[PDB]
Design an enzyme around this catalytic site. Structure first.
Site, PDB file in Angstrom:
ATOM      1  N   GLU A 163       0.717  -1.173  -0.064  1.00 44.88           N
ATOM      2  CA  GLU A 163      -0.112  -0.049  -0.110  1.00 44.88           C
ATOM      3  C   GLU A 163       0.951   1.296  -0.090  1.00 44.88           C
ATOM      4  OE1 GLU A 163      -2.875   0.352  -0.729  1.00 44.88           O
ATOM      5  OE2 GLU A 163      -4.181  -1.609  -0.081  1.00 44.88           O
TER       6      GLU A 163
ATOM      7  N   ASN B  82      -7.907   9.708  -5.732  1.00 43.27           N
ATOM      8  CA  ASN B  82      -8.331   8.970  -6.644  1.00 43.27           C
ATOM      9  C   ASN B  82      -9.344   9.905  -7.588  1.00 43.27           C
ATOM     10  OD1 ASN B  82      -7.637   6.208  -5.719  1.00 43.27           O
ATOM     11  ND2 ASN B  82      -8.539   7.064  -3.896  1.00 43.27           N
TER      12      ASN B  82
ATOM     13  N   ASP C  78     -13.067   9.126  -8.247  1.00 47.43           N
ATOM     14  CA  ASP C  78     -14.306   9.265  -7.180  1.00 47.43           C
ATOM     15  C   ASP C  78     -14.212  10.364  -6.201  1.00 47.43           C
ATOM     16  OD1 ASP C  78     -12.659   7.953  -5.391  1.00 47.43           O
ATOM     17  OD2 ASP C  78     -14.367   6.845  -4.422  1.00 47.43           O
TER      18      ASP C  78
ATOM     19  N   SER D 229     -12.164  10.486  -3.714  1.00 46.13           N
ATOM     20  CA  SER D 229     -11.687  10.285  -2.609  1.00 46.13           C
ATOM     21  C   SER D 229     -10.051  10.208  -2.477  1.00 46.13           C
ATOM     22  CB  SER D 229     -12.159   8.761  -2.154  1.00 46.13           C
ATOM     23  OG  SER D 229     -11.581   7.762  -3.113  1.00 46.13           O
TER      24      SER D 229
ATOM     25  N   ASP E 123      -6.678   8.170  -0.406  1.00 47.39           N
ATOM     26  CA  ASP E 123      -6.176   7.109   0.647  1.00 47.39           C
ATOM     27  C   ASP E 123      -5.082   7.606   1.603  1.00 47.39           C
ATOM     28  OD1 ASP E 123      -7.725   5.301  -0.821  1.00 47.39           O
ATOM     29  OD2 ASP E 123      -6.331   5.293  -2.637  1.00 47.39           O
TER      30      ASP E 123
ATOM     31  N   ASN F 272      -9.149   4.581   3.111  1.00 47.16           N
ATOM     32  CA  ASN F 272      -9.916   5.420   1.955  1.00 47.16           C
ATOM     33  C   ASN F 272     -10.891   6.147   2.601  1.00 47.16           C
ATOM     34  OD1 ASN F 272     -12.440   5.557  -0.166  1.00 47.16           O
ATOM     35  ND2 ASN F 272     -10.177   6.015  -1.088  1.00 47.16           N
TER      36      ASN F 272
END
Ligand SMILES: [Cl-]
Ligand SMILES: [Cl-]
Ligand SMILES: [Cl-]
Ligand SMILES: [Cl-]
Ligand SMILES: [Cl-]
Ligand SMILES: [Cl-]
Ligand code: NA
Ligand code: NA
Length: 130
Positions: free
Chosen positions: A35, A46, A49, A51, A53, A60
């Site tokens: 990750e 992102n 959408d 959002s 992380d 998220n």
């Protein structure tokens, strides 16, 4: 901060992650490696959408933490997403535990399915004293 491998393994063990909801320490280590490269400051926006992380586990903002800028998002860990960018990972660990209390468990992260599931993960904890 960027953790060294064995430092992180012992840090996660002291925080109660070994075997949490059936998930071995080596699986948590494999997750963190893929990750974020063990980096607590890691962020990924992102654009698709809206959002983001956050942190060592790339948790998220749509479901797990509040950053104020993700539309229609919820905050299941009841934390500011800022808490997931600290050098101390206690809050990130508490949130990761919350994530895996949901049905999918460790499968919640696609990177775990891609890089860790059905693989030999021994290397992540070898020599670390855990
Ligand atoms: Cl616990
Ligand atoms: Cl293990
Ligand atoms: Cl909130
Ligand atoms: Cl908040
Ligand atoms: Cl499995
Ligand atoms: Cl050892
Ligand atoms: Na809180
Ligand atoms: Na589950």
């Amino acid at each position: 901060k960027v953790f060294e491998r064995c430092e992180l393994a012992r840090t996660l063990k002291r925080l109660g992650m070994d075997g949490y909801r059936g998930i071995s320490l080596a699986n948590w280590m494999c997750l963190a490696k893929w990750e974020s490269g063990y980096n607590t400051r890691a962020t990924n926006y992102n654009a698709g959408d809206r959002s983001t992380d956050y942190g060592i586990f790339q948790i998220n903002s749509r479901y797990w933490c509040n950053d104020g800028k993700t539309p229609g998002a919820v905050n299941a860990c009841h934390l500011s997403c800022s808490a997931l960018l600290q050098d101390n990972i206690a809050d990130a660990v508490a949130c990761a535990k919350r994530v895996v209390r949901d049905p999918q468990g460790i499968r919640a992260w696609v990177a775990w399915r891609n890089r860790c599931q059905n693989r030999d993960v021994r290397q992540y904890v070898q020599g670390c004293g855990v």
